[PDB]
Amino acid sequence: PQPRKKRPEDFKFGKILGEGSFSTVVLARELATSREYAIKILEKRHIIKENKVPYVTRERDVMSRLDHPFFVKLYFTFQDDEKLYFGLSYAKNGELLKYIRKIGSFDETCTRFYTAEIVSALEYLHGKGIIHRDLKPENILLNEDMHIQITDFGTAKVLSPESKQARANAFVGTAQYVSPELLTEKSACKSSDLWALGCIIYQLVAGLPPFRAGNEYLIFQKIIKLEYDFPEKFFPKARDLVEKLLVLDATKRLGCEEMEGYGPLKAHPFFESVTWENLHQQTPPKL
Ligand SMILES: Nc1ncnc2c1ncn2[C@@H]1O[C@H](COP(=O)(O)OP(=O)(O)OP(=O)(O)O)[C@@H](O)[C@H]1O
């Protein structure tokens, strides 16, 4: 027997935290507890009209399966006549992208710490057979203690035991972080997230993502050609790691099953001083 189903009247809604194409996230205080949640509100009619039932269902189903400190938690759901409501942890500090823009680019200690939390999160996700498929700084949020909270699971793929690949459109997902296999084979794998990881590490160090251009078509062209360069002074061991992640052949990316998994990735020299066992209990370095 769970707690009774919550209702809109149980909350004092506040500011809008963000607005997507099919949802709006609003800060809400539960009257009975004074707890604050980020409630994601989606209109049923619009979801049905635009054929998005599978994505909303997927977002709910994946989030309910995750139980790990580096993921946004789904605490409850409810609905009224027109809207679905998902009660989520409120990540007080916002998007990682905000910090990249604010401070410009991360020093080595900061890059290493945040990269480690992301790698630890992906290990967990991938161990559950889930491909994120849209990993990017916009969807890596930060809690009040400046630990990461990954979100945005509606476009995730859930692999079956028998399958390492899932059909996926590149035009879905964010161009700058799209893996070459989505553009060439229209298929996603766990290693697609490792490609995105390489883009993100590059972005933390350089301040901008590796594949940039005036439009999406031009970005995609750069991705399939591996057309990017490292800036001068890019931390040498991080460059080496990124070179091992931004690999056109998805089976040759450090961390993938064919490269023997997360062992060899976490053992990379860039992570030498990392203690992996309890990152969420360590004090993040100041940005
Ligand atoms: N759990 C949360 N805590 C704090 N802020 C959040 C939380 N979840 C989402 N946000 C913020 O709200 C924004 C809106 O999220 P939402 O899932 O509604 O759409 P989106 O993913 O940003 O855009 P789109 O769906 O069109 O790709 C996010 O981009 C983020 O800035």
UniProtKB/Swiss-Prot annotation:
Recorded GO MF terms: 3-phosphoinositide-dependent protein kinase activity; ATP binding; phospholipase activator activity; phospholipase binding; protein serine kinase activity; protein serine/threonine kinase activity
Region PIF-pocket, residue ranges: 42-86
Primary localization: cytoplasm
UniProt subcellular location: Cytoplasm; Nucleus; Cell membrane; Cell junction, Focal adhesion
Keywords: Acetylation, Activator, ATP-binding, Cell junction, Cell membrane, Cytoplasm, Kinase, Membrane, Nucleotide-binding, Nucleus, Phosphoprotein, Serine/threonine-protein kinase, Transcription, Transcription regulation, Transferase, Ubl conjugation
First-level EC class: transferase
Induction: Stimulated by insulin, and the oxidants hydrogen peroxide and peroxovanadate.
Domain remark in the UniProt entry: The PH domain plays a pivotal role in the localization and nuclear import of PDPK1 and is also essential for its homodimerization.
The protein's name: 3-phosphoinositide-dependent protein kinase 1
Gene name per UniProt: PDPK1
